[PDB]
Here is the input.
Amino acid sequence: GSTIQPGTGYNNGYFYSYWNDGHGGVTYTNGPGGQFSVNWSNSGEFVGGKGWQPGTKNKVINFSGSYNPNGNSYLSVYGWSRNPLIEYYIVENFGTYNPSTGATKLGEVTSDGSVYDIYRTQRVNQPSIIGTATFYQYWSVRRNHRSSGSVNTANHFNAWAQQGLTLGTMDYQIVAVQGYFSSGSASITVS
Here is the structure.
């Protein structure tokens, strides 16, 4: 495949972020409107997708396309808040690994045609949007996996807050394919 250079910016009106760990084996392209594609084969770590900078706490995010992982990968609404620093995921599909494995369950929320299980995890002295830090991650993991739909983010953020999982001010908010040493392909359009 073809690829763009890792980085962030705007393409056809949408914020995008594409990051990888330099290992090789992943290509990411921006397409028309809210479209992006990812192809990977024996990758390292990467995250790529399109959306908004900053996100909001009441966005209804629409996504559609295909997602074909072979190994460890996620398809999510993905983003960060600052103050507090939080990395968050509304996981619509994944590959061989459910990212909530071993995590403490903090409740359930029903949204957009499925129940989601809610979890919190912690990253200790790990990279972040503000540098190396220790910070929480919040997860809503969809029970009914899919690669198209609509995500009413408020339903998740409100359920998280109810459970004591506070978000600060929103940084970027994208529909992202994340991979960890895996293979696959995906083609997703956001709006």
About this structure: Residues 53 and 172 are 4 Å apart (CA to CA). Residues 153-162 form the longest helix (10 residues). Residues 1-191 form one domain.
